[PDB]
Amino acid sequence: GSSGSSGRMLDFRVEYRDRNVDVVLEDTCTVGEIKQILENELQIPVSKMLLKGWKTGDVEDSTVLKSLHLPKNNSLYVLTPDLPPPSSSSHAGALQESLN
């Protein structure tokens, strides 16, 4: 059965322009995960997303949660400067051979 090893879940509340999403991942996961994760729920590219609001200055994706020892209730926020604003429909912006 399930015994011996235990993993504490962390509720990371990511406040994004669109809305606040709840994230749950063991402390074993890498800080970078939270990023790619938010994409599986917000469908947003980690590239356009900028993880911020850490515990100490700026944390590197090469760091693990268990390292920072985040509290039970966590609150983060994403900032997409490049990515355009959330709009139902728009006209401005045509497609044509051109790098992104």
CATH at 27:
3.10.20.90
Q: Which domain holds residue 75?
A: 8-79
Q: Is residue 86 part of a domain?
A: no
Count of other CB atoms within 10 angstroms of residue 10: 18
Q: Is residue 3 part of a domain?
A: no
Per-residue DSSP letter, 47? T
Q: Is residue 64 part of a domain?
A: yes
Strands, sheet with 9-15, edge to edge from the N-terminal-most edge strand: 20-26, 9-15, 73-78, 51-52
**69 and 59 in contact (C-beta within 8 Å)?**
no
Residue holding tokens 């599986």?
40
Which residue stretches of 1-100 are H helix? 31-42, 65-68
Considering its fold, how many domains does the chain have in total? 1
Q: Closest by alpha carbon to 34, among 13, 17, 7? A: 13
Q: Is residue 93 part of a domain?
A: no
Q: Is residue 84 part of a domain?
A: no
- CB pairs under 8 A, 24+ apart, for 45-50? 45/83, 48/80, 48/82, 48/83, 49/78, 49/79, 49/80, 49/83, 50/78, 50/79, 50/80, 50/81
Q: Is residue 2 part of a domain?
A: no
Experimental method: NMR
Q: Is residue 37 part of a domain?
A: yes
